[PDB]
Design a protein around this ligand. Structure first.
Ligand code: NAG
Ligand code: NAG
Ligand code: NAG
Ligand code: NAG
Ligand code: ZN
Lengths: 596, 195
């Protein structure tokens, strides 16, 4: 018979067997998460190992189907997903060495501690000592010491491990018909076989560079504003023309500028929008929060949560005997089993993250009719973008007035809008240069453009060129500062955080084009609008069955990632910054250093 | 004044598998559907051919008491002119089907933690099903171009799969018990009228 007919039945069997095994593994992991016992750990390890062994055996079996004689797009996608060799192509000794290297790197990252001399006992881990010191202390010397000590007591144990990891991953990628590991990671956005909706693996770099170039001026103005505020904070440590030292950007690595908000408030006489008091006063619990979230999602036409979600999910910290992780997460075990794990507290932040996780659950519920191999977002940026759009819709003052939570006498003025847009930009704008820079450095290190003996020398060059961040203490080649970050030392892609930040702003305005919104884009709400809900559901229900270009076009009317809606969103703050920067200088000089 | 044995079928401890669905032939008694017509202890009742609104005055030759248990979302497939997994590999109803179907949830009974591998259903078949046909074969399904030699291997599968019913499924995956009462009438005195 035809090869596609010989593969259809194989796919059916794989689906019917993988559903049960994935359900077993997910159930075991959930039981571990909600109840930490030794038997739970053993059960979860056994289930995970069984699922992984079955997956590997099925992939080995599937590798025998010639893809060159199959034309159906869905079957081609499923078999291409199932036919990956992975790291098995590498030799057994090399594979064992790679696994040992990865485990050692993760253990060093998550186990090392830092302490000053003459205190060999009281040594702080990364949390909650280093993070709190970075995000709360205003002492220059203490911050510098913490930064340099964390980067000097860890990178030494990472540099040779990282070099061997780079070599092994590069040879593994080359053995699997790829140019290098960077190409292997870029292959997630690759689209082929569809006429008029194709995407090249090398086009991602070009698109990212174009988007960053057209973004640049807003980041320059924001950096000038932040630099002026920091200079006013530190009278004799920051030059009026220099870049920003790396040990003064809120957290350890300067990924987010959120913690800078307390030092960059435009109008400090008007308090922020904190509605914790109204949350506490009206006798409001976690169940009420989730019912409000469900009502908000119902108001746009999306279905409501089932009884199993209410019965099985854990929406409150158990306390007493049970010990559970409090990181919120939307679990999709499969077969109609959806749950949300979170330690709810009476706070507006929990109110927003409830909407985030419920959007995750709704998107998981949307594509439950797809085959097992296509039950995920179109690419690695769609899913969190759909998560964040719900929070953006629900954070507006109009929605908070639509739930009877704020006094109707509260009238929004331009000062509060400026404060809100600056707070949003200190998280959205302040991370795109960092993400792009780190991904570019890793890509070109894998490609081989940077020789080893020059790695650090290139890494801190872009900090002066792109991010505009300077080094407080000179660094030698033996350091491995970039490896100190979480994602790089755990073999994680780091470009998904870029495209997502754009994709959401493309979706938002598109939905607001069906909500008939009049006015600025920073106050649009999709509530009580069935057209926007239907437009969103059209994209959500597709899952991975179609190229992500088609999914993007089905909502925004464009076949490529774009950033113009982001600038449209930030136009008011952009104009305010342009007016305020009449005396401050836009730009920075790379040759400036604090130590000269 | 013989009451037809409808009482002992609904509340049986266990029902057979989907591909071994149980049948009962009922004749020469009195069956009253008004007991379940206005009581509502079930969840779903629907049917074709005969209107439930007091049409037991007619006479039928025999009553078929088909019974089995399936997945929830497959309850839609027990209907005339339907196509799917059940309608192609497990049970196929005639296009002009006359009779009634009652489906109700059975999560408190047929659901066990860590799975309830006791219910079997066919997944692969070489053809379709003629109306009112039985399948009790255990032959290995051939999908490739080589003999299977009676063992599972390349392009050789076991045609039966087990429902892993566990009390934490969604409403779609939860077990549903289905009873099909078929009123077969032909050229006969048709003593089974049910006054
Ligand atoms: C958690 O696990 C322990 C031992 O595994 C058990 O005794 C306890 O009942 C479990 N808690 C719950 C809520 O099931
Ligand atoms: C692939 O096969 C499916 C059958 O499940 C069909 O619906 C679809 O149109 C086919 N597509 C192509 C491109 O052959
Ligand atoms: C890698 O995949 C190709 C086809 O994708 C296959 O021919 C080859 O055997 C695989 N490698 C190994 C070691 O099996
Ligand atoms: C969810 O919405 C449906 C509307 O089709 C409604 O019938 C159902 O009762 C709702 N769920 C709850 C728990 O109210
Ligand atoms: Zn998320």
């Amino acid at each position: 018979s035809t090869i596609e007919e010989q593969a259809k039945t194989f796919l059916d069997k794989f689906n019917h067997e993988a559903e049960d095994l994935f359900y077993q593994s997910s159930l075991a992991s959930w039981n571990y998460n909600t109840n930490i016992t030794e038997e739970n750990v053993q059960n979860m390890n056994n289930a995970g190992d069984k699922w992984s062994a079955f997956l590997k055996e099925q992939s080995t079996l599937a590798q025998m189907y010639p893809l060159q004689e199959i034309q159906n797009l869905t079957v081609k996608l499923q078999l291409q997903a199932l036919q990956q060799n992975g790291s098995s192509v590498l030799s057994e000794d090399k594979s064992k060495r790679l696994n040992t290297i990865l485990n050692t790197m993760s253990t060093i990252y998550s186990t090392g501690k830092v302490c000053n001399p003459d205190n060999p006992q009281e040594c702080l881990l990364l949390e909650p000592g280093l993070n709190e010191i970075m995000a709360n202390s205003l002492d220059y010397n203490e911050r510098l010491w913490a930064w340099e000590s964390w980067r000097s007591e860890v990178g030494k144990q990472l540099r040779p491990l990282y070099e061997e990891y780079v070599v092994l991953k590069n040879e593994m990628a080359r053995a699997n018909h790829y140019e290098d590991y960077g190409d292997y990671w870029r292959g997630d956005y690759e689209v082929n076989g569809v006429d008029g909706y194709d995407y090249s693996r090398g086009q991602l770099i070009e698109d990212v560079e174009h988007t960053f170039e057209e973004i640049k001026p807003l980041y320059e103005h924001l950096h000038a504003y932040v630099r002026a505020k920091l200079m006013n904070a530190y009278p004799s440590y920051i030059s009026p023309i220099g870049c920003l030292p790396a040990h003064l950007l809120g957290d350890m690595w300067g990924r987010f500028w959120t913690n800078l908000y307390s030092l960059t408030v435009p109008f400090g006489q008007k308090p922020n929008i904190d509605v914790t008091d109204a949350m506490v006063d009206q006798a409001w619990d976690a169940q009420r929060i989730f019912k409000e979230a469900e009502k908000f999602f119902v108001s746009v036409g999306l279905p409501n949560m089932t009884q199993g979600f209410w019965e099985n999910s854990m929406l409150t910290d158990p306390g007493n005997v049970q010990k559970a992780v409090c990181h919120p997460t939307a679990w999709d075990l499969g077969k109609g089993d959806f749950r949300i794990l979170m330690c709810t507290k009476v706070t507006m932040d929990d109110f927003l993250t409830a909407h985030h996780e419920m959007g995750h659950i709704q998107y998981d519920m949307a594509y439950a009719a797809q085959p097992f191999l296509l039950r995920n977002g179109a690419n690695e940026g769609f899913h969190e973008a759909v998560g964040e759009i719900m929070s953006l819709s629900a954070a507006t003052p109009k929605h908070l007035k639509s739930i009877g939570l704020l006094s109707p006498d509260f009238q929004e003025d331009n000062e509060t809008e400026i404060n809100f847009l600056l707070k949003q930009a200190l998280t959205i704008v302040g991370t795109l240069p960092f993400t792009y820079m780190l991904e570019k450095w890793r890509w070109m290190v894998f490609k081989g453009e940077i020789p080893k003996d020059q790695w650090m020398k290139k890494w801190w060059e872009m900090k002066r060129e792109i991010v505009g961040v300077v080094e407080p203490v000179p660094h030698d080649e033996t350091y491995c500062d970039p490896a100190s970050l979480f994602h790089v030392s755990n073999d994680y892609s780091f470009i998904r955080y870029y495209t997502r930040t754009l994709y959401q702003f493309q979706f938002q305005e598109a939905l607001c084009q069906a909500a008939k919104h009049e006015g600025p884009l920073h106050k649009c709400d999709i509530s009580n609008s069935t057209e926007a809900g239907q437009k969103l559901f059209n994209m959500l229900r597709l899952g991975k069955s179609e190229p992500w270009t088609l999914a993007l076009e089905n909502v925004v009317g464009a076949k490529n990632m774009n950033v113009r809606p982001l600038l449209n969103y930030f136009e008011p703050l952009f104009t305010w910054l342009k007016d305020q920067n009449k005396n401050s200088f836009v730009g920075w000089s790379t040759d400036w250093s604090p130590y000269a | 004044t013989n009451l037809c044995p409808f009482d002992e079928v609904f509340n049986a401890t266990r029902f057979a598998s989907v591909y071994a669905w149980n049948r009962k032939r009922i004749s020469n008694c009195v069956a009253d559907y008004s007991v379940l017509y206005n009581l509502a202890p079930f969840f779903t009742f629907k049917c074709y051919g005969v209107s439930p609104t007091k049409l037991n005055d007619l006479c039928f030759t025999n009553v078929y008491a088909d019974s089995f248990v399936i997945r929830g979302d497959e309850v839609r497939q027990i209907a005339p002119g339907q196509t799917g997994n059940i309608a192609d590999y497990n049970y196929k109803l005639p296009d002009d089907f006359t009779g009634c179907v009652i489906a109700w949830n059975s999560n408190k009974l047929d659901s066990k933690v860590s799975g309830n591998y006791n219910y079997l259903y066919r997944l692969f078949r070489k053809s379709n099903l003629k109306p009112f046909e039985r399948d009790i074969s255990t032959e290995i399904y051939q999908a490739g171009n080589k003999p299977c030699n009676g063992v599972a291997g390349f392009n050789c599968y076991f045609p039966l799969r087990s429902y892993s019913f566990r009390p934490t499924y969604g409403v779609g995956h939860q077990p549903y018990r289905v009873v099909v009462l078929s009123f077969e009438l032909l050229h006969a005195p048709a003593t089974v009228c049910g006054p």
